[PDB]
Structure 1
């Protein structure tokens, strides 16, 4: 419950500073939380898809990598 606010205001501030943002408004935060939510929706839909077709009750990192390969946002480093 309410784990979208587990994304803290200083976390959005920190990711703004790493990306290069200087002046952060107050209306940005929940829009950022919503975009993060939609992204995680599509990704975990594909992850559960590959998990169910594995016929295994555990989600692996390899499945996450393969789903990201299905996106176009390919992640190296963790195998596959």
Structure 2
């Protein structure tokens, strides 16, 4: 609705590069907004946890260690049962 709501962290060319890197060949024009929405949820979840760890450590500065641990919550996805 307002400017702040529409602040983005990945550009449309970047979305296309990431898509090509993932093997995509053709895209709906609606994919840019979809991808941005999914990225914002991912970042909200990770940053929420990262901030929790930073606060418990009596810090105001978020460290890579906080981010690395928060990134484990998504689990590890692979093909097959190895």
The normalised TM-score by structure 2 is 0.78
Q: Where does the alignment leave 5 or more consecutive residues of structure 1 unmatched? A: none
Question: Could you say what the CA RMSD is over the residues aligned between the two structures, in angstroms?
Answer: 5.3
Q: Does structure 2 conserve the Cα–Cα contact (< 8 Å) formed by 1:43 and 1:68?
A: yes
The whole-number CA distance in structure 1 between the counterparts of 2:79 and 2:23 is 24
Task: Report which stretch shifted further, 67-76 or 6-15.
Answer: 67-76
- Runs (4 or more) in structure 1 with deviation over 3 Å come to 1-6, 73-78
Q: What is the aligned length?
A: 79
Greater share of residues in strand: 2
- The CA deviation at 1:5 is 3.4
**Is this contact kept in 2: 1:12–1:29, CA < 8 A?**
yes
Gaps of 5+ in 2: none
